[PDB]
Amino acid sequence: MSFDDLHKATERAVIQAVDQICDDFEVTPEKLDELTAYFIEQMEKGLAPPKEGHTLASDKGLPMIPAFVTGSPNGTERGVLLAADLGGTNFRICSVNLHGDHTFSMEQMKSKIPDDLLDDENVTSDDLFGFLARRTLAFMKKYHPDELAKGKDAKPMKLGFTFSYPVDQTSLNSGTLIRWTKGFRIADTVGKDVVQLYQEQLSAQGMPMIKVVALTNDTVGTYLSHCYTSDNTDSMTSGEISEPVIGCIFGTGTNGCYMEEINKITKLPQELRDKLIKEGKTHMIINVEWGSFDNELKHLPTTKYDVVIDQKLSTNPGFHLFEKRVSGMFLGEVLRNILVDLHSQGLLLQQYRSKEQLPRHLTTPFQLSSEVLSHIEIDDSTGLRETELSLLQSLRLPTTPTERVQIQKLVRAISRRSAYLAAVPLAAILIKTNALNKRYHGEVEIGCDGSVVEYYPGFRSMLRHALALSPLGAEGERKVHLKIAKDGSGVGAALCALVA
Amino acid sequence: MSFDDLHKATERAVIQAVDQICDDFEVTPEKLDELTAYFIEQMEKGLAPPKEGHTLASDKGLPMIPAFVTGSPNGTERGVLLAADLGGTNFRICSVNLHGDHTFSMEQMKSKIPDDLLDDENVTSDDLFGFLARRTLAFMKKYHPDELAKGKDAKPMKLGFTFSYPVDQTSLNSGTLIRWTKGFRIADTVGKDVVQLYQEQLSAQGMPMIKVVALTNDTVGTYLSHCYTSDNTDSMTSGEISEPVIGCIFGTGTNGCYMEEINKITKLPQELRDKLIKEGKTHMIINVEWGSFDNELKHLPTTKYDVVIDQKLSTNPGFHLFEKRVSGMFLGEVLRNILVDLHSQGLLLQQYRSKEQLPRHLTTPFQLSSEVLSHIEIDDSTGLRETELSLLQSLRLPTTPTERVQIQKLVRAISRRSAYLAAVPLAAILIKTNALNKRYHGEVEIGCDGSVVEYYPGFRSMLRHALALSPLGAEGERKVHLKIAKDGSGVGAALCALVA
Amino acid sequence: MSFDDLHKATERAVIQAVDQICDDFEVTPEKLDELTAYFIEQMEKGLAPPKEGHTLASDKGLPMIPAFVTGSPNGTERGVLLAADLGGTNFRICSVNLHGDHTFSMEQMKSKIPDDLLDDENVTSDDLFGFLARRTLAFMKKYHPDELAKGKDAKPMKLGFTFSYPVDQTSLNSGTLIRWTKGFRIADTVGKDVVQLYQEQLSAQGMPMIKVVALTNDTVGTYLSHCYTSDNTDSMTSGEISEPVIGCIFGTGTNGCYMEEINKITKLPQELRDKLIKEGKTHMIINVEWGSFDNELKHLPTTKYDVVIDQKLSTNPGFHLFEKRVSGMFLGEVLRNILVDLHSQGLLLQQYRSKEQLPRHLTTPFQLSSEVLSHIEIDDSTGLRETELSLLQSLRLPTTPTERVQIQKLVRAISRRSAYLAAVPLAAILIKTNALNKRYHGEVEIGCDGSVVEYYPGFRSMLRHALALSPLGAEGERKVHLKIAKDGSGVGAALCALVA
Amino acid sequence: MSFDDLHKATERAVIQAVDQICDDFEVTPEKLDELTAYFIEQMEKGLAPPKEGHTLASDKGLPMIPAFVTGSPNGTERGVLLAADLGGTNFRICSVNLHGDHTFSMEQMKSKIPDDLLDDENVTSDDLFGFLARRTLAFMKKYHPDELAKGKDAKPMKLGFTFSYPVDQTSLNSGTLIRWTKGFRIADTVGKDVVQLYQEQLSAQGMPMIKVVALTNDTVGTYLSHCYTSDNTDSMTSGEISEPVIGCIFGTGTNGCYMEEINKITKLPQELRDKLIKEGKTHMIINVEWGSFDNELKHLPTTKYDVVIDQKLSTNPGFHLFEKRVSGMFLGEVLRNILVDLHSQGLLLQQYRSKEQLPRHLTTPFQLSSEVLSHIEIDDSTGLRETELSLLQSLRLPTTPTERVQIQKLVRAISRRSAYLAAVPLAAILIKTNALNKRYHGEVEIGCDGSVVEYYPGFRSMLRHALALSPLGAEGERKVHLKIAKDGSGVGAALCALVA
Numbered sequence A, B, C, D: 001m002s003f004d005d006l007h008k009a010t011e012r013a014v015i016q017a018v019d020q021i022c023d024d025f026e027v028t029p030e031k032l033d034e035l036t037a038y039f040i041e042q043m044e045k046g047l048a049p050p051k052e053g054h055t056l057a058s059d060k061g062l063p064m065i066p067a068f069v070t071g072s073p074n075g076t077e078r079g080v081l082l083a084a085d086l087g088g089t090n091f092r093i094c095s096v097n098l099h100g101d102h103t104f105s106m107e108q109m110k111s112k113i114p115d116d117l118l119d120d121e122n123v124t125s126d127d128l129f130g131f132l133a134r135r136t137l138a139f140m141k142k143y144h145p146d147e148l149a150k151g152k153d154a155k156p157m158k159l160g161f162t163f164s165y166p167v168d169q170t171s172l173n174s175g176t177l178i179r180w181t182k183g184f185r186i187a188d189t190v191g192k193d194v195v196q197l198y199q200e201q202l203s204a205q206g207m208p209m210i211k212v213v214a215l216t217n218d219t220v221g222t223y224l225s226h227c228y229t230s231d232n233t234d235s236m237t238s239g240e241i242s243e244p245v246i247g248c249i250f251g252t253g254t255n256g257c258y259m260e261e262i263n264k265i266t267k268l269p270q271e272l273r274d275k276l277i278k279e280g281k282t283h284m285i286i287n288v289e290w291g292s293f294d295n296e297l298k299h300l301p302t303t304k305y306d307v308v309i310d311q312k313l314s315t316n317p318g319f320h321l322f323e324k325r326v327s328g329m330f331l332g333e334v335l336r337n338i339l340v341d342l343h344s345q346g347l348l349l350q351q352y353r354s355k356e357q358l359p360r361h362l363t364t365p366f367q368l369s370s371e372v373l374s375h376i377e378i379d380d381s382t383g384l385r386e387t388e389l390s391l392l393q394s395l396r397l398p399t400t401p402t403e404r405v406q407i408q409k410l411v412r413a414i415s416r417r418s419a420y421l422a423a424v425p426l427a428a429i430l431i432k433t434n435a436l437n438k439r440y441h442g443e444v445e446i447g448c449d450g451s452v453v454e455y456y457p458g459f460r461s462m463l464r465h466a467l468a469l470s471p472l473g474a475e476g477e478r479k480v481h482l483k484i485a486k487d488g489s490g491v492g493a494a495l496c497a498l499v500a
């Protein structure tokens, strides 16, 4: 045994731990099927009246929100509307000029949500909504300075507001916050009317001229934006015309929505179901809180790393268990926990004696962005050798050549687990509504927004693969196109405000 | 307001524009009566000597041509004669074997008039007449190759020549072109002898053996052909025997002719009226240039779409205003202008941003054939849903379901306007000559040739209806039969050549 | 037995004959597989050196032409070039402004090929090429009148010439006509240089300024045009990037071409293969004369109606047997022969006593356009009842209600036979070159031009179905997109002239 | 010429433009020498009294600031002090426990400077300093919550304040802002006392307990931190003991400072020079505003891209010309301007028709971070092929394979130009003070902080190379070590506060 043979014995120990992790992470079709079936069962429960002791702030299971849109655009909608979009790492304000030909011209200003609003439980509703109103002034000064200069007399501006949190919507115009998720801890807005808080701050800042017309989700805005764009009006002689079914968000969090029959939403008051069916409003866009799927954990492929994020690092433990396996914030956090744990086992970061000596950004939660993971996974031979080091050097964590390949294997296992689980709600929705066979012919479109699905170098293809593996089978995959709703939330909110 | 309600609001706007057009197009009996009366007044003027400053190339009003036929056949005429027929979208050569029993056996060769002769003002008389002579050689090679092989010694062939243009006829044998109409722009034949140009080209091509015997119109040939065929010799005990009164053309253009008393044609030289009355030639077949009726526009139900065709798209602006409302070329063009105008209003072709993006065949004049209109109008429920799309797809213009019904309404309004106006000259002629009461009993026949009246799925019945609405009343309609002179122009020219 | 029961007994006899025909026409997967395999065998033979006694004018089998393009565009090509396109029912001249962004702006003039050039064996090379030169003058007068006015001094204009006939190409600049097909009988151009004849006539007409730069086929132009347009440059993170493989023509005739490895074309001189491989010219676009597939008839599903067209009605008996089953000219002719034969059997046109009394346009060959078939097939319930009559009325053939449904069944059987046979060459080409598996991922595009594939209300979907039935299987169909190369031949020739 | 040959001709055009740019960017030793010599001349002028008409807000040339530190640490300094650090993309607060053994334990909180303070001229002193005070409260709540809870009675906290802007320092305790640079436009703080504004806001927010003890630069803090750490106390028998000479910042901006003899600072009042020399204070740490070197542009290798940044995009045109060639903000901006200009020339982004169609983040200034450049440059073969696309995809700019290599060449040319120019001030300082020969033996240390020097995968080695190329020669490079002052500004300010 030379030093090189002794080193190989160590490398084999490292490899076994990494392979064990990779196998714990991979989703096998058997679980993909248990999950699709369970997802559908929870979807039916999510439409049902609550039992005694249940509420929305505390529910568990897979709740659904009956957003009152009740239809979809065809691209002919026209007009200029404002849109606000809150809830990722950032906030955006758009001015969307809908042209009536399946396109729009969008102006945009965007900013990061300041950490003053995210790291402290003592942050109030006035700090968050005061922020949004100040950014709204900045937007108006750049794109519509005249309306701002002429307000209060200039009027109205119609604004749609996308707010990416579960909202107990009662009307397209308004609803209340059910809970904060995804990084916000601002407790005094839970139960309050989201539009009311924003609208009051807009007036407080000098813009009584801007009226918030509609409150929507990101999933809904995405679906509607997707519907507005492309064509879906081809010739009936081209042989097949597609239809939008499902909207997705794969960003800091994960969600989607779909068109559903109004007569099946048993929790909606019957009087409202009757009022709407009488006008031909046979369908609603339902926000399925995918993130909450299996919060009780009867089927998801949970490992110890997911337990740690959910119980110790997350802002809302016990909720949004699906997101913790799928969305961008947790793809990042899962790798960080693995690297720290393989430090403790003495397998990767062998040079440190012990955890307290690790780089501070490695031990601090959420400092490993899914952006680094994107580069870690795409890197091929020379990327892995040289760039993987640069990518982790930016997290102050220098590594060896052999360590870098082991880290890449962990990253691919993490993103694969997510991409396959991410297919569960798409298969489950298409199957529940029989989207694939409600019509003899016509393709199924899924309009997905969010930076993980748009940029992660692997999701577009891994979802298609996973859909084929799920109960949809190859035949279902053949009907189903994953398209990107790039301007997704912005256009969607503008359309919601147009609808009012 | 859901997307579906917003879409209905748009559909209502579309409908209002289409209904406004349909109402502008419909001819009400009040105008049908003003027009019948005006038509008769212009017919009397059309027989009168001209005033100083008037000529035939430039006249206005409703000119008539005193074709020198002076009588009608009874079906006993026999012999084999050639016939040439120029002036629609095509040209035909026939060899008609008249059998003497109200029937004939017709051989035919036909060809399209090449665009080389239609789209350029620099086309000469030698190109048009050279064309006719070359097609004549082709005809002879197929049906009478022996006469061609034996010519110059084989002789004579007698040919009748139907030339569908106003001709200043001086004798059945010849006359000059008054103007070009209906698509021809060959200026150097205006004022020239039509037979002379054709006869010279026949010799130039090697056929000195063929003599053009008679020059006729299509209206005249149709009347005579109609008279030749059926019976009109039934028993006097069958209770009632009919007589031919009016011939019609409803093809690329529109015209007709009728039998008139020679003593009323005040512009004909008196010496000629005397020469003919002395031989019992009490009547002449008069070509009424229906197409020119109301060229000055005092009564026709003119809309902006007709103004555009007459001033911008037509080959002879200011003339043939009636045809522009009635004939096949303009049924086609009127729809095209409406669709382009409803594009500009944002009502039908809503997907284009603006006119320059429309299919090139939609913006190009005369590319919308009345043939497409025929199918657009006949289509019932499933035809409208599926075939209307195919019909416009052939014009490269894909449409929506709701657009297709709106287009069909416009098409029916266009063909109805034409069919009712088309009744004006038939009512006006029968009334002026008192065809309905010159005899106690005996039916009135109108022998109409032309593809619009023969195939358009609506003219046969719409004219009968319109005749009943006009001053003829139901009582006049009861005397009047619309029959189709199917082999119309061919037989007619053969008879004209037989007459010489 | 009442009259109605006796009539049903007759209808059953009619139905049996129609069903027998429909079954003779349907292509079963077993034959679709024999044909794909045979097509591939003949394709290999088509690349081989000839045997003694063989030439190109007379070959039989499935010849291929090694067009010297040797590559494909990526959309960045820019410049303004002229293009001429001869050989369908018409001729087109374009001026194509290539912009370098996968789009172009095309100006166009088009005209029908006059019958003077099609119905007579005594037509010479000077009449056909004189025609093309005259239409070229007309084009220049409308789009580039200044170049024409300034020529001879203004120069050069670069023109690509698409000539849809087999051409024994020796260089992209020129080659000779192998045979006339598809309606032309002009024997004295066979064996002559196609460009030389056109170029001389352009000078004869006054345009020494226009140089014909490249001679191409329609199949080649279509492939290149298809390649030029869309993108095929998406992100490698979108998950899959497509590549053009096969170009198609489904118009008056049928053909296609594909990219092939130069080292496999064994008949090309080795010295030329070496000259080209040394510059990286690893592939050529090969015109596969699909029309000639199985001219000897060992596998095609031939019936008596196809025998009649090939031996009695066609301009080139014994050749282009595949086209006679597939292309637009013969979809039309096959129905006509069936209707005449069912007249002779006393089943459809029961009112005539015998063939000589049938409408002359029914007994005359090629008067039944595939355009009528398009409408006959698309028509649903009310279309069949009312429009089928109008469509055949335009062929002067009035029918009964029961006759109309029987005719529609025959039409669908005819177009299905064609659509399935039409898939044979696409499956055969993709399989021979392993287009489906030469790369792990990336879609396969087929760029098809021609009015049958673009407008016939059934081909887009019937080909996709047939491809799945053929040896490609569903898995091959999943890679394969049928797209329409709408401006196909025009752009292609402009690119060929750009290439020179 | 095949499509592939035509494409190569285009690629050659692209390459020539890229090579021309690369050659314009490369710094040749001849200029490196002109610049070193000029830098020294301007350094002498920078110590001189001003001429009439000169001030500090407007100076030009290379000003120096005589920070009143007057000495350096040896690692024995002990105590716990707070430190604030403002002025990059972010702001940091530290609590540094100096231990007296060349090490310290640092606690840290950091946040991004909100855009509310950077994009608007109407931002006031109260918004910037209010921000710093609020972040200070957050820091105290996490690391010293007891002092905050006990204040006002708990006291004092001693805070050092690093403020990375030129400051007209009069005492280590305070000075005024000379100008804003590097992204700030807050005009009403220019001329005001920097400590006074911060100190007042700390009291306003509830922390009268924290006293700002010292105001320093980042360059000074870095030098002192560097001096505090390692050893520099080795045995005199180890053969050679090093000494710190120069501190550097290579972050969003670029600067450094060095120890200089007090008797040479001719602009300092003589009375102050005498007061200090009498106590043995023979040296001062002088901030050399490297960024301002050659603001008048007599020697820097200026190209058109640098002119655009300086005159159109920068917050302070005419100043800090050296930084615009060297620092992280402009490495980013220079590439962006090149890519847009090569779009205009039609060489890289060939698919767009024109600038208005480019991705909005490409045309927006400063959206291309030097972070992307880091990855673009490090990428080797497979990194360039796949990751370069991901890196630009994050700027919404998809590219081709050939485009990616051309972009990488531009990036390496940009970072090389910077790295070589970046050596000018280090060579110039060591040469001016004869750091290399003031002692027979002992190494020269340069302590550089800042993320470009710490992470850019190329600076550590390119500076060493450039130093050898400059007048220092290989012999000077052999004395000179580039080390990283990682905790640099934080420790430095804590030491400045310890010094008071």
Ligand SMILES: Nc1ncnc2c1ncn2[C@@H]1O[C@H](COP(=O)(O)OP(=O)(O)OP(=O)(O)O)[C@@H](O)[C@H]1O
Pocket: A086, A087, A088, A089, A090, A164, A218, A249, A250, A251, A252, A253, A254, A328, A329, A332, A369, A370, A371, A372, A373, A374, A449, A450, A451, A452, A455, A456, D394
């Ligand atoms: N290129 C990338 N590769 C991988 N992950 C990325 C990339 N860019 C952003 N992300 C992830 O996406 C998150 C931002 O999500 P996104 O841009 O979709 O905003 P969002 O719509 O506001 O999110 P949400 O809708 O859930 O609130 C980041 O925190 C990071 O985790």
Ligand SMILES: OC[C@H]1O[C@H](O)[C@H](O)[C@@H](O)[C@@H]1O
Pocket: C087, C164, C165, C166, C167, C181, C182, C217, C218, C219, C249, C251, C253, C254, C255, C256, C289, C291, C320, C323
């Ligand atoms: O137009 C389609 C095809 O028609 C004929 O079959 C020709 O042989 C062929 O070269 C051409 O491409």
Ligand SMILES: [Mg+2]
Pocket: A088, A164, A218, A249, A251, A450, A489
């Ligand atoms: Mg979002």
Ligand SMILES: [Mg+2]
Pocket: B088, B164, B218, B249, B251, B450, B489
């Ligand atoms: Mg006629």
Ligand SMILES: [Mg+2]
Pocket: C088, C164, C218, C249, C251, C450, C489
């Ligand atoms: Mg063609």
Ligand SMILES: [Mg+2]
Pocket: D088, D164, D218, D249, D251, D450, D489
């Ligand atoms: Mg700094």
